[PDB]
């Protein structure tokens, strides 16, 4: 049965990882996790997101393909770093290494780039040109990518050691320093090097920062990352307080100021959507709160955040003519951007690790577990999230510490 009283002590400290799918009575759990990976990292052009990159017939590396019907397929640091994370959790080293080779070779901006703000960060959007060769479309970073790269590399070091192709550990420490020196403001993850007083709630994964602190060697840096972790929980608590009740109606938003206040409307040229929207980025916030609760312990704010957000989505579904909650809300109002797909459902399942309502857990868990693995043109974001969620709900998303 659903454990509606999640522990205040996290799996990272106790070593006890929940298996949510087992709590909800499911069977053949690990088989489903394994086939999810196999189909996403298999050459089937159906669920597949992992693709080889070759140059003049010579194999180079692999990437996670951000399939994009509206605008041409492209290749993103978010997906790449998520793919690596998935691979390390399932002990899939080749897959890991093939994705990391790509990132280091082709995503990384040179350390001597003329713009100091871009030095060593990872270009968020690549494409293959008309002749099949990779190029950078936008050199700016998507800092959630670097955060996952560092996390995945530290775990690869811990599981596999550093004497093969890659010194994963050194690559991880380099990545951490890049995050600290290029992608932080006042110990809060940046949305952009070029804009201050701006974060994206979905980029906040407080447990990762605690894991970083435990995996660096020097006292100053250990304290730096524990402070990041504390400030991140504070940001999230503040954002959840600001979105409670009117006018945001309990869903977190795309963009926030450093005090947690939702950003209202547009604030910069190029911005994809209004700041106050619960949209594709924001879906992941309560997923991250679930992660944090699982790994580092559930506190009152975790539970409130999740229960209130899931509560709003269930209400919203009762007030939808399609009998679904949708992908995009703004001030509690549906924006007619489609019924939730698999990724959003996956994020909400993971959130259950902070839920205290068994009824909600039944509903949201079974909606996720009933799905088939994503296919078709929208599978990059849905399928990437589906994979992560499969790991999280099966007790496979773990922190592997290095030993010193």
- Cα–Cα distances in angstroms (integers) from residue 113 to residues 7, 183, 208, in the given order: 47, 16, 28
Instruction: Check: CB of residue 137 under 8 Å from CB of residue 74.
Output: yes
DSSP, residue by residue, 11-64:
HHHH-----HHHHTT-SSHHHHHHHHHHHHTSS-SSS--EEEEEETTEEEEEEE
- Cα–Cα distances in angstroms (integers) from residue 183 to residues 3, 9, 66, 142, in the given order: 37, 30, 23, 9
Q: CA nearest 202: which of 139, 124, 291?
A: 291
Where do we find the tokens 């205040």?
A: 8
Where do we find the tokens 């459902």?
A: 345
SS3 of the chain: helix, strand, coil, percent, to 5: 50, 10, 40
CA distance 326 to 322: 9
CA distance 148 to 50: 17
- Pairing status of strand 188-189 against strand 123-128: unpaired
Q: How many residues does the chain have?
A: 404
- Contacts of 143 by beta carbon, 8 Å cutoff, 6+ apart: 179, 183, 189, 190, 191, 203
Cis check: omega of the bond before 292, within 30 degrees of 0: no
Instruction: Check: CB of residue 122 under 8 Å from CB of residue 185.
Output: no
Looking at residue 327, what DSSP letter applies? Answer: S
Helix (H, G, I), strand (E, B) or coil at 339: strand
Q: C-alpha dihedral over 220, 166, 383, 79, to 10 degrees?
A: 60
Instruction: Check: CB of residue 93 under 8 Å from CB of residue 102.
Output: no
- Pairing status of strand 277-278 against strand 329-330: antiparallel
Give resolution in angstroms. 1.5
Instruction: Check: CB of residue 219 under 8 Å from CB of residue 159.
Output: no
CA distance 334 to 345: 16
- Report the largest interatomic distance among the alpha carbons of the chain, rounded to a whole angstrom: 58
Instruction: Check: CB of residue 278 under 8 Å from CB of residue 347.
Output: no
For residue 321, give the CATH number of its domain.
Answer: 1.50.10.10
Residue 271: exposure state from Cβ atoms within 10 A (0-12, 13-18, ≥19): middle
- Give the Cβ contact number of residue 320 at 10 Å: 13
- The total of structural domains in the chain comes to 1
Looking at residue 109, what DSSP letter applies? Answer: P
CA distance 380 to 84: 15
Q: CA nearest 7: which of 281, 367, 255, 353?
A: 353
b/e for 64-81, b at 16 or more Cβ within 10 A? bbbbeeeeeebbbbbbbb
CA distance 64 to 40: 9
Reading the block at residue 142, the tokens are: 């998507």
Looking at residue 319, what DSSP letter applies? Answer: T
Residue 44: exposure state from Cβ atoms within 10 A (0-12, 13-18, ≥19): exposed
- Pairing status of strand 134-141 against strand 123-128: antiparallel
SS3 labels along 135-166: EEEEEEECHHHHHHHHHHHHHHHHHHCCCCCC
What was the structure determination method? X-ray
Instruction: Check: CB of residue 354 under 8 Å from CB of residue 6.
Output: yes
Reading the block at residue 140, the tokens are: 């700016």
- Contacts of 66 by beta carbon, 8 Å cutoff, 6+ apart: 73, 74, 75, 76, 79, 380, 381
Backbone conformation region of residue 177, classed left if phi is above 0, alpha if psi is from -120 to 50, else beta? alpha
Backbone conformation region of residue 331, classed left if phi is above 0, alpha if psi is from -120 to 50, else beta? left
- Contacts of 371 by beta carbon, 8 Å cutoff, 6+ apart: 342, 345, 386
- Pairing status of strand 50-55 against strand 58-66: antiparallel
Structural domain for 127, as ranges: 1-404
Alpha-carbon radius of gyration of the chain: 20
Where do we find the tokens 């997923």?
A: 287
CA distance 96 to 92: 6
Where do we find the tokens 């489609």?
A: 338
DSSP, residue by residue, 182-203:
HSEETTEE-S-TT-SS-B-GGG
Q: Is the dihedral of CA 88, 160, 64, 36 positive or negative?
A: negative
């Amino acid at each position: 049965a659903f454990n509606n009283n999640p522990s205040s002590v996290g799996a990272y400290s106790s070593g006890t990882y929940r298996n949510l799918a087992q709590e909800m009575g499911k069977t053949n759990i690990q088989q489903k996790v394994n086939s999810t990976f196999d189909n996403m990292f298999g050459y089937n052009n159906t669920q597949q997101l992992y693709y080889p990159y070759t140059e003049n017939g010579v194999y180079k590396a692999h990437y996670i393909k951000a399939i994009n019907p509206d605008e041409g397929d492209d290749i993103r640091t978010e997906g790449q770093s998520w793919g690596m994370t998935a691979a390390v959790m399932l002990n899939k080293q080749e897959e890991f290494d093939n994705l990391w080779r790509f990132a280091k070779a082709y995503q990384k901006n040179p350390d001597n780039h003329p713009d100091a703000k871009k030095q060593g960060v990872y270009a968020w959007k690549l494409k293959l040109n008309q002749n099949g060769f990779v190029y950078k479309v936008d050199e700016g970073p998507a800092p959630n990518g670097e955060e996952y790269f560092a996390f995945a590399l530290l775990n690869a070091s811990a599981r596999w050691g550093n004497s093969g192709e890659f010194n994963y550990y050194n690559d991880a420490i380099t990545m951490l320093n890049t995050i600290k020196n290029k992608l932080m403001e006042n110990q809060i993850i940046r949305f952009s090097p070029y804009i201050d007083n701006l974060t994206d709630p979905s980029y906040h994964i407080p447990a990762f920062y605690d894991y970083f602190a435990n995996n660096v060697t020097n006292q100053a840096d250990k304290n730096y990352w524990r402070q990041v972790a504390t400030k991140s929980r504070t940001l999230l608590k503040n954002h959840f307080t600001k979105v409670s009740g009117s006018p945001h109606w309990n869903l977190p938003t795309f963009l926030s100021r450093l005090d947690g206040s939702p950003v209202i409307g547009y604030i910069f040229n190029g911005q994809a959507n209004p700041g106050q929207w619960y949209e594709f980025d924001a879906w992941r916030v309560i997923m991250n709160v679930g992660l944090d609760a699982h790994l580092m312990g559930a506190q009152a704010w975790h539970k409130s955040a999740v229960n209130k957000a899931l509560g709003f989505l269930s209400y919203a579904k009762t007030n939808n003519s399609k009998n679904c909650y949708e992908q995009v809300y703004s001030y509690g109002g549906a924006q007619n951007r489609g019924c939730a797909g698999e990724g959003q459902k996956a994020a909400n399942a993971v959130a259950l690790l902070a839920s205290t309502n068994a009824g909600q857990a039944n509903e949201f868990f079974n909606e996720f577990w009933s799905l088939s693995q994503p296919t078709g043109d929208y599978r990059y974001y849905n399928g990437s999230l589906y994979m992560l969620a499969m790991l999280h709900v099966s007790g496979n998303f773990k922190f592997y510490n290095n030993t010193f």
